[PDB]
Amino acid sequence: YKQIKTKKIYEEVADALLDMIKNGELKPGDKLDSVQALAESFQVSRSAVREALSALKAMGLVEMKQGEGTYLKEFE
Ligand code: NA
Ligand code: NA
């Protein structure tokens, strides 16, 4: 029961972001914090955050509005 999955660091970060989506902290259409801000908040490298955001992008959860920021997808 307490045989918890072990994960790579970027996967811990991706899961924390998914959690925030589920709990309504990060809402569809919201601009995500910068890589630097997320790295500091999660106590990980910029590299880990970028890999986590690539994972979310591959899940179709992320987009760009023209440019200058990463946004949670609002409309599928
Ligand atoms: Na592993
Ligand atoms: Na973490």
**What does the domain layout of the chain look like in residue ranges?**
9-72
Resolution attained, angstroms: 1.5
28 alpha carbon – ligand 1 mean position (Å): 30
Ligand nearest to the CA of 11: 2
Nearest alpha-carbon partner for 39 in 21, 60, 17: 17
> 67: which residues sit within 8 A by CB, 6+ positions away?
none
64 alpha carbon – ligand 2 mean position (Å): 24
65 alpha carbon – ligand 1 mean position (Å): 34
> 56: which residues sit within 8 A by CB, 6+ positions away?
14, 17, 18, 62
Task: Say which CATH architecture domain 9-72 belongs to.
Answer: Orthogonal Bundle (1.10)
Which residue type, as a one-letter code, is found at position 5? Answer: K
56 alpha carbon – ligand 2 mean position (Å): 15
